[PDB]
Each structure stands twice: as structure tokens, then as C-alpha cells.
Amino acid sequence: VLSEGEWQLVLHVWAKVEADVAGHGQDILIRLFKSHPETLEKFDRFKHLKTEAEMKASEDLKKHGVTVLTALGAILKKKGHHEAELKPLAQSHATKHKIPIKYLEFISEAIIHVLHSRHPGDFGADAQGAMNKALELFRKDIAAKYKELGY
Ligand code: HEM
């Protein structure tokens, strides 16, 4: 459980993300696919983009960066009272996209990496720990929905 103070660190960082949501999202997807190439295979739409240079050039990941980060932002803004926002996403990722929890761990590493890269002097130890606690709660809660569904 996060404190209100930690939630405020999380949401203050999120406002930075929102100043360039497509670029942050593109960067996170590139990191995910470059660091864990098996993840790219889950995306039939994007799996032609096998090099970092192709990924970075693609209008596809800029647009998709908005999709993923807007959804994550909406969940973060619920400060863990996020069951309703989280549920449809868990369902879609278990059944339709078939995404293991390990892959959500991979994208969580990519999020922290990019936040650090893009905000080197304004994403410190406290903000990074708080964001890690928020992402852990997100993953825990998706894992609980996965268990309920039998995925
Ligand atoms: C922060 C974690 C994530 C968030 C917030 C998120 C959110 C979303 C959203 C909002 C959509 C569009 C609606 C839908 O089809 O459900 C989506 C689609 C999808 N997600 Fe995720 N996702 C996350 C992580 C992942 C990961 C780690 C993978 C795979 C390694 C993945 C695979 C997919 C796939 C394959 C689609 C369909 C993409 C398309 O063809 O349009 N997601 N996700």
C-alpha cells in the first residue's frame, strides 16, 4: 500500500510523462522490444520492427505509446483504488493478448529506465521507489485477476 505522499511522487512524475506521452511511450516500447525480443512476437501489428532504428522511425510505436501510457496513467491516477480501471485490461491481456506476468515485469523495468533517461535530474531515489511500488501494485493486482480468470 502506498502512502498519499508516495502517490504524489508518482503523479508528479506522471505529469512529466504527459508532456511528451508519445515519445515516452515509444521509448518504453523500444526498450521492451530491444531488451526482451520475445515480447515483440506478441504484437502481430508491430513485429516487422526488429531493429531499434526501425522501431524509432515507426509512426506505429509513437501512436501505440499513447495507447499504453494513457491507460497506465488512468490506473495510476486511481491510486490503487483501481480495480474497475484495471479489470478490463487484465481480461484483455490474459485472454486475447496472452501476456504473462513476467512480461509486465519487463515493461515495468522499461518504464523506470525511460523515466530515468528522460528526467535525469528530476527522477530521484524517492520518486523511483514510489514508482516501483505503484508498478508492483499494478502487477500484483493484474496477477490476482489472472488467477481469478484461470490464466
Ligand atoms: C503497463 C502495462 C500495459 C498497459 C497499461 C497496457 C495497455 C494496453 C491497452 C490500453 C491496449 C489496447 C486495448 C486492448 O487491446 O486491451 C493494449 C493492447 C495490447 N497489449 Fe498491452 N498493456 C500493457 C502491457 C503489455 C505488455 C507487456 C504486452 C506484451 C509484451 C502487451 C501486449 C498487448 C498487445 C499484443 C495488445 C494488442 C495491440 C494491438 O494489436 O493493437 N501489453 N495494451
Resolution (A): 1.5
Pocket-testing residue among 40, 63, 68, ligand 1, by greatest number of atoms within 8 A of Cβ:
68
Contacts 24+ apart (CB under 8 A), 1-7: 1/80, 1/137, 2/79, 2/80, 2/130, 2/133, 2/134, 2/137, 4/79, 6/129, 6/130, 6/133, 6/134, 7/79, 7/80, 7/130, 7/134
Atom 30 of ligand 1: nearest residue by CA position? 39
Ligand 1 atom nearest residue 69's Cα: 5
Distance of CA 129 to the CA centre of its chain: 16
Domain 1-151, CATH 3.40.50.2300 — does that match?
A: no
Atom 31 of ligand 1: nearest residue by CA position? 99
Cα 46 to Cα 27: distance, rounded to the nearest angstrom = 14
Atom 15 of ligand 1: nearest residue by CA position? 92
3 state DSSP class of 50: coil
- Looking at residue 34, its amino acid is K
Residue keyed to cell 525511460: 114
Give the chain's radius of gyration (CA, Å).
15
CB-ligand 1 contact for 67 (6 Å cutoff): yes
Helices (H), the chain: 4-17, 21-35, 52-57, 59-77, 83-91, 101-118, 125-149
Cα 147 to Cα 44: distance, rounded to the nearest angstrom = 26
3 state DSSP class of 46: coil
Burial class (CB in 10 A: 0-12, 13-18, 19+), 26: buried
- Looking at residue 18, its amino acid is E
The count of other CB atoms within 10 Å of the CB of residue 43 is 17
What is the per-residue burial (b if ≥16 Cβ within 10 Å, else e) of 45-66? ebeebeeeeebeebebbbebbb
Return the domain boundaries, the chain: 1-151
Cα 127 to Cα 112: distance, rounded to the nearest angstrom = 10
